[PDB]
């Protein structure tokens, strides 16, 4: 019978609720009611990058703190040089509708993807020094929203068919497919060991996978609306989430509970991109009201604003060494803050 | 004094900038149209009947999972781009944000099917009041006019049952019936058109409009209607930056 199954599910939900209530003791704010406030940080755009003819939807920082690839609905994958505002590559996309981007942690590959349910992988360094689609990965029955290069031979893709998959570039197969979401999976962030990754779905819930084994370990609730972005703490034990209910949230793995919610009454629009800082004390986050918001993980008090955009901020990423923040927005302009 | 690396990088950047400048004209000389509808709307037939105006050039292989489609047609050397959405899930709340820089959203409605016409009305209302589609004009294509004409002139329809306003309704004064059309068919057509225009006029303000059209099934002038509506939209947009309208 289905009614007994629903009753068992309700009882298990109550059991999980009371189990999580057994470790709350003191909230994060109570423990952290001693830290000095971070203070107002004013960031001014050091470099602004021009050349995209349409809204830019994604961007990734290369693992050298220098190069940066941007994806725009024009149909271009421009590879920049934030040091000198120099364009290095201008890869033309087969499908103009692209909503994700990636940079391999070697500088050799750059992936993309979009409404075409496909993941185009571009080889950056060939014998002729030209870009070309090394492989095209198909098998997703929905629009694709995030690609993160797990390695030089594996990428994890999150699509709109409520599933996440791990691919093998050499063959193009779907070695491991992650299922369990009831809505579109928007953004995913790997952990700083390339062993675990988490994905935020549109069903107002986040989950953590096991890459190798391929099943959920825990699920996290608390968000009221669709999750548009998600990041990872540099220690691999926390991950911030940004949703359409205008509230950023900080989850934890060992505690398996919500730790802090960042919100303000002046803020009513959702979050489009989230990126932690190097020390995990600056939770930068984009917003639909054309400006980002420099939060902080512990004090949870909005410190600074990188307001320089005339349209929705669509991507935001802190560099590996921590000396730059790039903000690409629907006004077709990338800005490097510092 | 640096030369070498810096000189080569500047040369490459200049070449890439030349390519981007050349691609700007091509990108801005074409109009992108989003085609929206349902399964029982003749949308595939509409795509087929505008596609006739455009090493193997045949690309019937494509991908089994498809994704997004494309159909480029040329009218008076304007090169429209029409994006029919393929194999995607039911919910469209988070990929419809991609279609915010679009000349017009073509919407196709089955006027004949009274049972599901309320679903089309609700979908059109949702499209009208979307935050990222508050400046995108919608071209309305009330498909299957021949089936409607067959249906009203045969009884067993009872449009009043589905819509309790047909009885207390009158033919619009500005009606232009086609020669040979019965008054009942024109009454039903304009009733459906006014049902959609009630949502179109409410809210909306003045930054985006709706262009109703009585496309039957296979009319060759669907593409000309699309061209004329796009031209009017562009003219109205250009008259607004100058604050002349």
């Amino acid at each position, epitope marked *: 019978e289905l009614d007994q199954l*629903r009753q068992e599910a309700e009882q298990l*939900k109550n059991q999980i609720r009371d189990a999580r209530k057994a470790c709350a003791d003191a909230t994060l704010s109570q423990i952290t009611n001693n830290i000095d406030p971070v203070g107002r940080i004013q960031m001014r755009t050091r470099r602004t990058l021009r050349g995209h003819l349409a809204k830019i939807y994604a961007m990734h920082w290369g693992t050298d703190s220098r190069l940066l690839v941007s994806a725009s609905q024009d149909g271009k994958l421009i590879i920049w040089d934030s040091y000198t505002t120099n364009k290095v590559h201008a890869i033309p996309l087969r499908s103009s509708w692209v909503m994700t981007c990636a940079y391999a942690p070697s500088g050799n590959y750059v992936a993309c993807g979009g409404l075409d349910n496909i993941c185009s992988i571009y080889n950056l360094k060939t014998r002729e020094g030209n870009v070309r689609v090394s492989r095209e990965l198909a098998g997703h029955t929905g629009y694709l929203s995030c690609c993160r290069f797990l390695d030089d031979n594996q990428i994890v893709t999150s699509s709109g068919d409520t599933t996440c998959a791990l691919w093998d570039i050499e063959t193009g197969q779907q070695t491991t497919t992650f299922t369990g979401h*009831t*809505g579109d999976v928007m953004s995913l962030s790997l952990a700083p060991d390339t062993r675990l990754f988490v994905s935020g779905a*549109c*069903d*107002a819930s986040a989950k953590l996978w096991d890459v190798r084994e391929g099943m959920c370990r825990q699920t996290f*609730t*608390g968000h*009221e*609306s*669709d999750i548009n972005a998600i990041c990872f703490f540099p220690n691999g034990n926390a991950f911030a989430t940004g949703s*359409d*209910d205008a509230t950023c949230r900080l989850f934890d793995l060992r505690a398996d509970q919500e730790l802090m919610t960042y919100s303000h009454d002046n803020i*009513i629009c*959702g979050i489009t991109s989230v990126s932690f800082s190097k020390s995990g004390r600056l939770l930068l986050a984009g917003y639909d009201d054309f400006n980002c918001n420099v939060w902080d993980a512990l004090k949870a008090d909005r410190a600074g604003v990188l307001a320089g955009h005339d349209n929705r901020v669509s991507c935001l990423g802190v560099t590996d060494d921590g000396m730059a923040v790039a903000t690409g927005s629907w006004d077709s302009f990338l800005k490097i803050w510092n | 004094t640096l030369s070498a690396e810096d000189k080569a990088a500047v040369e490459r950047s200049k070449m890439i900038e030349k390519q981007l400048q050349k691609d700007k004209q091509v990108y801005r000389a074409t109009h992108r149209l989003l085609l929206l509808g349902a399964d029982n709307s003749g949308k595939s037939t509409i795509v087929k009947q505008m596609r006739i105006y455009h090493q193997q050039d045949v690309l019937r292989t494509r991908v089994k999972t498809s994704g997004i489609f494309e159909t480029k047609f040329q009218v008076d050397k304007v090169n429209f781009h029409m994006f029919d959405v393929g194999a995607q899930r*039911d*919910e*469209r*709340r988070k990929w*419809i944000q991609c279609f915010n820089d679009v000349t017009a959203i073509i919407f196709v409605v089955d006027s004949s099917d009274y049972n599901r016409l*309320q*679903e089309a009305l*609700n979908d059109f209302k*949702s*499209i009208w*009041n*979307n*935050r990222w589609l508050r400046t995108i004009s919608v071209i309305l294509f009330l498909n299957k006019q021949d089936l409607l004409a067959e249906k009203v002139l045969a009884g067993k329809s009872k449009i009043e049952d*589905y*819509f*309790p306003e047909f009885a207390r309704y009158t033919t619009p004064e500005d009606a232009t019936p086609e020669p040979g059309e019965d008054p009942r068919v024109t009454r039903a057509k304009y009733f459906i058109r006014d049902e959609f225009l009630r949502i179109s006029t409410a*809210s909306g303000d003045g930054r985006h409009y709706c262009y109703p059209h009585f496309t039957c099934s296979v009319d060759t002038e669907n593409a000309r209607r699309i061209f004329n509506d796009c031209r009017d939209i562009i003219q109205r947009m250009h008259l607004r930056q100058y604050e002349l309208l």
Partner: nanobody
Amino acid sequence: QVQLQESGGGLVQPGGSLRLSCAASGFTFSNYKMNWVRQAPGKGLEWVSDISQSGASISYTGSVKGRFTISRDNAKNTLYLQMNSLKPEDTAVYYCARCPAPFTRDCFDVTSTTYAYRGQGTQVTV
């Protein structure tokens, strides 16, 4: 965790009156536009009525106009639908749905097959 529970469905003779209540939890009730969706057997989901954040704006489908009444209690986090003069064609599973995002007028995907913020349904038979 967004949860919606419906009650008040049961067997009723034609022309009777049935009241449905939908208690919501896990989200700020006053900030969302709530809907009612019914699924007749052998058919798909059909939108019935919707109510705005403040309860001012109200709309109904054609088949139920003048017979159904929808109201919301922001303080009690409950959504109501008063049904009058039930017809045999009104026999369906009734779901209490919610708009995906707050402070917005567009209610997308409320009638979808696998919508997330929707109740599990109550059976009404006439």
